[PDB]
Amino acid sequence: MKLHDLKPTPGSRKDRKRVGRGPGGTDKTAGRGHKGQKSRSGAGKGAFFEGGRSRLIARLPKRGFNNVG
RNA sequence: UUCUCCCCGAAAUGUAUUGAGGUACAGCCUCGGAUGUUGACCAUGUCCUGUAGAGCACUCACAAGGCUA
Ligand SMILES: [Mg+2]
Ligand SMILES: [Mg+2]
Ligand SMILES: [Mg+2]
Ligand SMILES: [Mg+2]
Ligand SMILES: [Mg+2]
Ligand SMILES: [Mg+2]
Ligand SMILES: [Mg+2]
Ligand SMILES: [Mg+2]
Ligand SMILES: [Mg+2]
Ligand SMILES: [Mg+2]
Ligand SMILES: [Mg+2]
């Protein structure tokens, strides 16, 4: 058939965010707002009072059956 | 921190922080889905309040006389 007339399903393919690159969209700061937002990123489940700091009740093992309703 | 036009559009508040020009959560923005008038204004009904004013009935302050250990 027409290898030139292969067409990807509309949708599916979508273009990448090219970030820097102009006051036509997402200019100077690259979607980042003028901040203490700077390259070498550091943290993901942390603030400093942590509060995932509730207490624990603990067993080690487990074992279980395959189910056949 | 570099190419274009189109649509919407904020925050500089709260609480926490060896925290205070940083950060977490919330708040406020946008997008898609769901409901689908529950939103907005203004009206009537109803309930709550101690400010403006005022007043000395209590507390404190206080002006001229009277009576008076
Ligand atoms: Mg864009
Ligand atoms: Mg800068
Ligand atoms: Mg670096
Ligand atoms: Mg507009
Ligand atoms: Mg507190
Ligand atoms: Mg701060
Ligand atoms: Mg947030
Ligand atoms: Mg929506
Ligand atoms: Mg409603
Ligand atoms: Mg209504
Ligand atoms: Mg008054």
Swiss-Prot record:
Q: Where is this region: Disordered?
A: 1-48
A biological process (GO) of this protein is: translation
GO (cellular component) term, any one: cytosolic large ribosomal subunit
Q: Which UniProt keywords apply?
A: Ribonucleoprotein, Ribosomal protein, RNA-binding, rRNA-binding
Give the Gene Ontology MF terms in alphabetical order. rRNA binding; structural constituent of ribosome
Keyword Cytoplasm part of the UniProt annotation: no
Subunit composition and interactions: Part of the 50S ribosomal subunit. Contacts proteins L4, L21 and L35.
Q: Which family does it belong to?
A: Belongs to the universal ribosomal protein uL15 family.
What is the role of the protein in this entry? Binds to the 23S rRNA.
UniProt name for this protein: Large ribosomal subunit protein uL15
Q: Which organism is it from?
A: Deinococcus radiodurans (strain ATCC 13939 / DSM 20539 / JCM 16871 / CCUG 27074 / LMG 4051 / NBRC 15346 / NCIMB 9279 / VKM B-1422 / R1)
The lineage is: Bacteria, Thermotogati, Deinococcota, Deinococci, Deinococcales
